[PDB]
Design a protein around this ligand. Structure first.
Ligand SMILES: CCCCCCCC/C=C\CCCCCCCC(=O)N[C@@H](COP(=O)(O)OCC[N+](C)(C)C)[C@H](O)/C=C/CCCCCCCCCCCCC
Ligand SMILES: CCCCCCCC/C=C\CCCCCCCC(=O)N[C@@H](COP(=O)(O)OCC[N+](C)(C)C)[C@H](O)/C=C/CCCCCCCCCCCCC
Ligand SMILES: CCCCCCCC/C=C\CCCCCCCC(=O)N[C@@H](COP(=O)(O)OCC[N+](C)(C)C)[C@H](O)/C=C/CCCCCCCCCCCCC
Ligand SMILES: CCCCCCCC/C=C\CCCCCCCC(=O)N[C@@H](COP(=O)(O)OCC[N+](C)(C)C)[C@H](O)/C=C/CCCCCCCCCCCCC
Ligand SMILES: CCCCCCCC/C=C\CCCCCCCC(=O)N[C@@H](COP(=O)(O)OCC[N+](C)(C)C)[C@H](O)/C=C/CCCCCCCCCCCCC
Ligand SMILES: CCCCCCCC/C=C\CCCCCCCC(=O)N[C@@H](COP(=O)(O)OCC[N+](C)(C)C)[C@H](O)/C=C/CCCCCCCCCCCCC
Ligand SMILES: CCCCCCCC/C=C\CCCCCCCC(=O)N[C@@H](COP(=O)(O)OCC[N+](C)(C)C)[C@H](O)/C=C/CCCCCCCCCCCCC
Ligand SMILES: CCCCCCCC/C=C\CCCCCCCC(=O)N[C@@H](COP(=O)(O)OCC[N+](C)(C)C)[C@H](O)/C=C/CCCCCCCCCCCCC
Ligand SMILES: CCCCCCCC/C=C\CCCCCCCC(=O)N[C@@H](COP(=O)(O)OCC[N+](C)(C)C)[C@H](O)/C=C/CCCCCCCCCCCCC
Ligand SMILES: CCCCCCCC/C=C\CCCCCCCC(=O)N[C@@H](COP(=O)(O)OCC[N+](C)(C)C)[C@H](O)/C=C/CCCCCCCCCCCCC
Ligand SMILES: CCCCCCCC/C=C\CCCCCCCC(=O)N[C@@H](COP(=O)(O)OCC[N+](C)(C)C)[C@H](O)/C=C/CCCCCCCCCCCCC
Ligand SMILES: CCCCCCCC/C=C\CCCCCCCC(=O)N[C@@H](COP(=O)(O)OCC[N+](C)(C)C)[C@H](O)/C=C/CCCCCCCCCCCCC
Lengths: 135, 446, 135, 446, 135, 135
């Protein structure tokens, strides 16, 4: 159901590029900014580069009246250093549970990753802003 | 006739003088807005003979250059050392544009490639005063008189204007080793991301360009499907048609002067006068991991500062040595407030750079922002960051010079501060540069 | 209900202070960061000064299991010139309607306000970040 | 005219002198940044005759070379002995970069291959002083006067600078055996894994290149589907067009000087002064199977050390003999801390090397790491490891020189220590080198 | 149960000592290497110093036949900086849940921390090697 | 099941190459790093060279809800010396037994092979790091 949604804004505040990979929405759909009806494909972001000082918005939502919610994962990798993984993100705004999940895992001492805005107590997962900076 | 070499030409006074005159071997090169062009005035006295070697091995030679304003130098077949010696003058006198295709960002790189199909005849050498040999070149008395007249002016500004005119007439460099013969040249520029393997890109471009020149098509496609625009230059067609096909050494015209005059001229050619002053901590900004310092007190009239620094001891003030004149690139540029959702300055003149992000609200109509200036691109070299702070929102870079063994490339350690993450949007590019020490004259009494 | 929630992050990107005034939630409650049970009063924000480069977070949500959303308003004012009105903000995340409202009204050319992250299609109103500058 | 050989040319004084002048036979070759190029100044006195033999057998000859900086020497058709004699100078004066395609790791091997389609006319020989014959070449009085002036200076640094200038002007080697005629050369470089059979790879590349020169295409495909980039040089057009097509023997210019002066000049050309000092055991490191030793006490100003060793007796300190100057490769390089997850030094100048891993935390701003230096690539030769320790985590290599029968290739037995498995990630490549004894001057009193 | 287990290897790849503090296993037990039946106390590791190039192993697992996994926390601390906190580590290999948690938090720019080997998808949390370097 | 898993990290700490051969998962499947649902083919590793100072990760797991563990073998051979065998590795994290098996066999006097991290008592076989060094 559209009531279960998440917006992930990857904002590259560093000076070197960061690439997205393995963007997979297990549940729900990816859609366009401000229009849950205008569904889009994961290919729109796969292997995309977020250049320094550039923002990239990913919108995910549950399907209409679907009683399913949304859930997905994606990796941030370093285009330099042979696509070495920077972080792995998993998000889940479930329809059947009052607890949302937003977990960032992985270790890469060459990158600083901060995130904020997520809601976990109840309702949608909210708008999550992620700032990435390669040291 | 057939079988003649440079030796036969040099032994004949008529043919030797024709070779000297048709190649402007007695003239300096003016590294100006139109590229390296010979001066119309003779810089040295005509020699009685030329030192030469014979070489007839025709072949294709490829070179690459990564400096920004060296396209026309590459098109003239300067080698790496000559390009390095000539780059400061070209950069200072070049025409800057914000729409240049050359990119030198921290993620993207650009390079010029040149392939020369050479039919050589030999090489000619000139003896500079620095070498102790007795066949040294002699500066023409007209040039020496011009230098003396320039240095005899009452005021430093008059002397500097006279020297600028003199070097615009006689040139900035003199070719000391030149190659003779014929050459078909092809030139191109390529931009690629730094994540790619540089060796493979260079090899692919080299293969494409060498194939283009060998079969000699304004556009070429390489093995990696790289779309290259190629500029072709013909310098082929008998000793009457031999021309300069390569420059393997150039000496700055100032370096040909006697030492007591050479030092004075080199000092007078420095774009800026420097001065150390006391600093003062910027109020507020307690959230930042380091203290921010600005020049203390009012800036003396006619002097300018270069940005906020982490150095608590002293700050550098600079003053232009040459007045502003149309057709001449100023040493310093003013800054203007940004358009939206930013309080950071923007350089008024394209391709100029400032060293620090502004910690506050920049206003170009009131102090201390009315005396903050950017720098001409020939004044600065890339620095190195060192980060302070535990979080992105509070982290700040302090920029330090890149250590070099040769003092010629030393840069000031101003400890310029660059905020890691500027709030808002539409902010300028982040400074990552340091000021060259050779551009600033200290203790000049002016 | 807790499914109707909003987070408003006022972020001062300028150099002049901005003040919050007349913060009133007509529906729902204000609560602490990440804890919808720890209700707080409008006095915790009324008249608070957001210094340049600082963030102030206001969290609102409906009453637990209440069949009511969260509706409220507040004002950004300039303390440098006698608390002149910079903007008026109104938010509505309703329980009984699919459309959320996020309205910024008022005007004074001395200030620039850019907000992002709001969700209006369905569900919660989401996390809204408001950047304010005086220029 | 038809049927004329080198004998007819040498008999006629006009033709003999044309042959001498057009081939720069009286001039040394400067092994510099641009490759082997002849000097413009005559090194020897013009002879009254030339020793020559006749040879008119046209054929294709292929050679290979495994040295790193010998590409331009191979392109000039130097044989193995000449390349070996000239390699030190080319290596010292070469332009280093980290993007070079040449690879010499322990799993990969690179080699240059050159195929010459030769149309010879004969060979010309010069008698060196060491031969003992009575028709020796005579050094030009200008060169002898230059050597005397260089050696007459006051301070050692002045003498070394004068000698550097003299050899940059006159050249480093003199060709004492040259082949005359015409040639068409094709040159390529191939990198391959050491696990492959070298004979098969060499035969494949040779067949491809010989097919290339025969029947004369910038890229060639061999039977084993190897893509080779080929550089073609044309030196073939009558006796007036005969050129030098191959060099069979070169003698270092310093070797032409009389012995009392030759020894002094050779000593003054050593890049480093050497000294032996006492050592102290590094505290801690009880886990390692050997004791680590470092120079004891403060290092005298201007002197540097080369790394940790297992020698409990003494350590070697080195001081550069030539001041740093732009356009010249320093004998030593500074080291900087690694980027991340490593506390090991990295050479500042590309292609330089240090001899030991740092057993501790390396800081270039504080001692003893402030005086730790790397070496120019011409200073070192590969060594051999001796492993100590029963486990991977505690194993350490001791580097020992590779025994050689000739003193010219001996290396110091410093017993440099290398950690078999460095903790962390991002560590630099393991050192494996040893320092040549010929680069270090002892007991100079400076 | 013994099927829920974790091995944490702290490996000092630097040149200065590091200390372990507040090692607490809230669920399960600490045991000896390769022997889950030999329990040990947190005192065996509390305050212990991991010298450069040394490895320290902490083995945790659930109680045998217990339907209860293992869960715990500890802190890496700088003994040469007044026992300043360097990092906080939390692990959970639960019995009744298919997701394992391995969280490293805290901030100390004087230290770099890498870790690898964790398994979060299913089964035991696995053997985690943590490399610590004070730069 | 996914509860039976193994991670094998081959770390070439020497100066010579080492080649993987005869890799075969007699049971279970090989998957990508941190994602047990992204099955991978054994050919992706067969004949691959682990260059000095390089790490190669092989992830094996039982099939989802399969009631069968994971098992396999492979060989490390010397690319020089005509692919002479360095070691033979056999791993087994069974579903029906509490005992895991990890055996390294074979004789090659000019190679040092060390391994650590295996868990044999119960549960998954764990993360096994293998260091190889040609003398
Ligand atoms: C007389 C007794 C007879 C009894 C008759 C019973 C017949 C019905 C059986 C089976 C339902 C048909 C299969 C549905 C599979 C579910 C997959 C799914 O729920 N699909 C979501 C898509 O969600 P999404 O795209 O986001 O991804 C999902 C995640 N996934 C990874 C899987 C893709 C999508 O919205 C949701 C759709 C579900 C609608 C089902 C309606 C239920 C019908 C009730 C009948 C009431 C009895 C009447 C007797 C009087
Ligand atoms: C006596 C007989 C009684 C009969 C009672 C039956 C009434 C229930 C029927 C239907 C309600 C549901 C409305 C759905 C409309 C919206 C379309 C939509 O939601 N479809 C996909 C979303 O697709 P998507 O998200 O990509 O885009 C969506 C937007 N877009 C415009 C772009 C398509 C999405 O999975 C589909 C979700 C619907 C799954 C629920 C199905 C319930 C069927 C239970 C049968 C019970 C029988 C009982 C007998 C006693
Ligand atoms: C005696 C025989 C009686 C038989 C009774 C059996 C009926 C089965 C009951 C169960 C069905 C329910 C399935 C759940 C799917 C809902 C999907 C969803 O979650 N629905 C949200 C909307 O989600 P959405 O955001 O997509 O809205 C649309 C957004 N859009 C932009 C498209 C407009 C919307 O709030 C949520 C609604 C909650 C469902 C209410 C059900 C009331 C049941 C009354 C029973 C009274 C029987 C008593 C008679 C005596
Ligand atoms: C008249 C006789 C009829 C008999 C009944 C037959 C009709 C068909 C019944 C059932 C099959 C169809 C199920 C629908 C699955 C939807 C897809 C899904 O799967 N919905 C989950 C989504 O989970 P989530 O929202 O958390 O998404 C994140 C998932 N994640 C993995 C990340 C956690 C989430 O549980 C939602 C589950 C709620 C569904 C309950 C429906 C009740 C069924 C009626 C009972 C009353 C019978 C009355 C008889 C008199
Ligand atoms: C026959 C006599 C029977 C008379 C009974 C009358 C039943 C009342 C009817 C209708 C009430 C309307 C919803 C009450 C407001 C809900 C508040 C809320 O929004 N409810 C959410 C959760 O709210 P919340 O997240 O805030 O929980 C608190 C957060 N916390 C973390 C603390 C848990 C919760 O999930 C989602 C609820 C979706 C609506 C469900 C509708 C199903 C009702 C079918 C009744 C059929 C009876 C048939 C009799 C024959
Ligand atoms: C035989 C005995 C029969 C007994 C029948 C008595 C049932 C009535 C009970 C009590 C009244 C309940 C209304 C109070 C509203 C609360 C305030 C409000 O107002 N609730 C709005 C929130 O609106 P919203 O959140 O969207 O906006 C807020 C801000 N804004 C400014 C925009 C408005 C929201 O929609 C309105 C929701 C409607 C409630 C649905 C549940 C009723 C279930 C009936 C069960 C009957 C079973 C018995 C049948 C035999
Ligand atoms: C007449 C009514 C029926 C009576 C029977 C019901 C009583 C309850 C039965 C059994 C509870 C089981 C506790 C939960 C597991 C304990 C925790 C654990 O995790 N159990 C692991 C242990 O493995 P462990 O690693 O800890 O071994 C430790 C080290 N050791 C050396 C010992 C190996 C072991 O694998 C896993 C076992 C799970 C099996 C589930 C069995 C389901 C029971 C079906 C009952 C069907 C009744 C049918 C009536 C019509
Ligand atoms: C006449 C028949 C009477 C039968 C009635 C008897 C029922 C027994 C009473 C209630 C069980 C009491 C639980 C005590 C252990 C709780 C410890 C714990 O806590 N168990 C959690 C472990 O959670 P976790 O591993 O994740 O902890 C990690 C830490 N963390 C904080 C992160 C969570 C885990 O979920 C939950 C496990 C529950 C096991 C289920 C066993 C079912 C038995 C079926 C027998 C039925 C027979 C039927 C015949 C007709
Ligand atoms: C007339 C009576 C007929 C009925 C009798 C049948 C009884 C069955 C007995 C024996 C089954 C044989 C083991 C089932 C195969 C195991 C597959 C698996 O291994 N099951 C794991 C899965 O773990 P997995 O990691 O693979 O999860 C997947 C990964 N994912 C990420 C997607 C979650 C899961 O956890 C843990 C499973 C524990 C065992 C579950 C079964 C116990 C309940 C017994 C009920 C007894 C009732 C008796 C009635 C009289
Ligand atoms: C009165 C009712 C009596 C009913 C008749 C009973 C007969 C059916 C029972 C069981 C026998 C069949 C064993 C399974 C063989 C497959 C071996 C295998 O393959 N199982 C995994 C492993 O996969 P894996 O990749 O690891 O294999 C590695 C490769 N190797 C070759 C080495 C195996 C692989 O996922 C596949 C798993 C499927 C398991 C079967 C689940 C269905 C259970 C029966 C359903 C029908 C019951 C009907 C009741 C009314
Ligand atoms: C009234 C009677 C009640 C009937 C209930 C019986 C239980 C059936 C439903 C619930 C379990 C079915 C889902 C579990 C499989 C997960 C899907 C999958 O996938 N199983 C593959 C995994 O393989 P893999 O790991 O490689 O791919 C995974 C990755 N993927 C991308 C594909 C998701 C692989 O075959 C493994 C298969 C073996 C599963 C064994 C389950 C026991 C079945 C006992 C049937 C007995 C009949 C009884 C009738 C009286
Ligand atoms: C009236 C109905 C009666 C139904 C009876 C007929 C149908 C069911 C019987 C036949 C089971 C068919 C298993 C298929 C296995 C295929 C995978 C495999 O074969 N799994 C092995 C290997 O997997 P493992 O990983 O452990 O080994 C590692 C590999 N290695 C080679 C090293 C060993 C390992 O034994 C695992 C064995 C566990 C099997 C569970 C059996 C419990 C279910 C019976 C409960 C009966 C309840 C019904 C009563 C009414």
């Amino acid at each position: 159901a559209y009531a279960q949604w998440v917006i992930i804004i990857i904002h590259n505040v560093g000076s070197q590029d960061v690439k997205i990979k393995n963007l997979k929405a297990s549940w729900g759909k990816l859609h366009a900014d401000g229009d849950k009806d205008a569904e889009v494909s994961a290919s729109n972001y796969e292997g995309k580069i977020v250049k320094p000082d550039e923002k990239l918005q990913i919108n995910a939502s549950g399907r209409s009246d679907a009683a399913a919610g949304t859930t997905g994962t994606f990796d941030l990798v370093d285009p330099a250093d042979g696509d070495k993984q920077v972080r792995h993100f998993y998000w889940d705004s479930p329809w059947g549970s009052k607890t949302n999940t937003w977990t960032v895992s992985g270790s890469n001492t060459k990158w600083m990753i901060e995130y904020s805005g997520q809601n976990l107590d109840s309702g949608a997962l909210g708008t999550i802003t992620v700032d990435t900076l390669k040291k | 006739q057939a079988g003649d070499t440079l030796n036969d030409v040099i032994q004949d006074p008529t043919r030797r003088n024709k070779l000297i005159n048709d190649n402007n071997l007695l003239k300096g090169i003016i590294m100006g807005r139109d590229g390296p062009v010979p001066s119309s005035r003779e810089l040295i006295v005509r020699p009685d003979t030329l030192r030469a070697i014979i070489n007839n091995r025709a072949t294709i030679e490829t070179t690459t250059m990564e400096a920004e304003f060296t396209e026309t130098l590459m098109e003239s077949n300067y080698n790496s050392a000559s390009v390095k010696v000539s780059a400061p003058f070209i950069t200072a006198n070049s025409e800057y544009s914000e729409s240049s295709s050359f990119k030198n960002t921290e993620t993207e790189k650009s390079m010029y490639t040149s392939s020369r199909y050479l039919f050589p005849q030999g090489r000619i050498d000139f003896t500079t005063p620095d070498s102790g040999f007795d066949d040294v070149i002699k500066l023409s008395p007209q040039f020496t008189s011009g230098v003396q007249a320039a240095l005899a002016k009452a005021t430093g500004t008059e002397k500097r204007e006279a020297l600028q005119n003199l070097f615009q007439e006689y040139g900035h460099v003199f070719r000391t080793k030149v190659h003779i013969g014929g050459v078909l040249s092809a030139h191109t520029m390529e931009t690629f991301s730094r994540s790619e393997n540089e060796t493979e890109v260079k090899q692919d471009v080299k293969a494409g360009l060498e194939g283009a020149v060998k079969g000699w098509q304004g556009t070429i496609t390489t093995s990696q499907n790289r779309k290259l625009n190629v500029k072709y230059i013909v310098n082929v067609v008998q000793s009457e048609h031999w021309r300069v096909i390569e420059v393997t050494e150039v000496t700055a015209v100032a370096d040909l002067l006697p030492q007591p005059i050479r030092g004075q001229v080199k000092d007078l050619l420095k774009p800026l006068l420097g001065k150390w002053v006391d600093v003062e901590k910027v109020p507020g900004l307690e959230s930042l991991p380091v203290s921010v310092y600005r020049p203390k007190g009012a800036i003396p009239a006619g002097w300018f500062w270069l940005g906020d620094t982490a150095d608590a001891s002293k700050a550098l003030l600079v003053k232009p040595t040459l007045p502003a004149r149309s057709g001449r690139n100023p040493a310093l540029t003013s800054l203007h407030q940004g358009s939206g959702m930013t309080e950071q300055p923007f350089v008024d003149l394209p391709q100029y750079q400032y060293l620090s992000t502004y910690f506050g609200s920049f206003a170009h109509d009131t102090p201390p922002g009315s005396t903050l200036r950017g720098l001409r691109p020939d004044h600065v070299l890339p620095g190195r960051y060192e980060m302070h702070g535990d979080t992105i929102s509070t982290a700040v870079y302090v920029t330090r010079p890149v250590d070099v063994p040769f003092p010629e490339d030393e840069c000031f350690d101003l400890k310029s501060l660059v905020r890691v993450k500027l709030p808002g949007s539409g902010n300028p590019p982040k400074p990552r540069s340091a000021l060259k020490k050779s551009m600033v004259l200290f203790d000049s009494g002016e």
